[PDB]
């Protein structure tokens, strides 16, 4: 069986529907574009402050740990409020545990239209292949 990540939306997030993402292979977190649209079983979001290739999430069988990696995002990735890498820089793999608060992007105000676009803020639940919560 595959490891499983569940992304649930937090109150200060741009709204999204709960995601059930199986981690048979590493999963790209990123912004919706006609080639990839949001689905209940992916980590693609219709959120303008997310990068196209924002981050990667995967399960490592050797360590038994789950990892998140920022892949040169413009606006940042955060675990429990701690940023993974500077803008346009790649982070190392950073361990995530069930219950962690993961943020993709930051709020951005579009100055000419004076509309604030929220970021994605998620509680993540993580399950080992054997079903045990991480």
């Amino acid at each position: 069986p595959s490891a499983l990540a569940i992304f649930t939306c937090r109150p200060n997030s741009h709204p999204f529907q709960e995601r059930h993402v199986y981690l048979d292979e590493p999963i790209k977190i990123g912004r919706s574009v006609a080639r990839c649209r949001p689905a209940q079983n992916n980590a693609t979001f219709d959120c303008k402050v997310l990068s196209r290739n924002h981050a990667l999430v995967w399960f490592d069988h050797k360590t038994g740990k789950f990892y998140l990696q920022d892949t040169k995002s413009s606006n940042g990735t955060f675990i429990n409020s701690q940023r993974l890498s500077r803008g346009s820089e790649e982070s190392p793999p950073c361990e995530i545990l069930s219950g962690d608060i993961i943020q993709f992007g930051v709020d951005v105000t579009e100055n000419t239209r004076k509309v604030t676009h929220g970021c994605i803020v998620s509680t993540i639940k993580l399950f080992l292949p054997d079903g045990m919560e991480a």
Partner: peptide, 6 residues
């Protein structure tokens, strides 16, 4: 590309 940037 195309990201709304702070």
């Amino acid at each position: 590309d195309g990201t709304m940037k702070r």
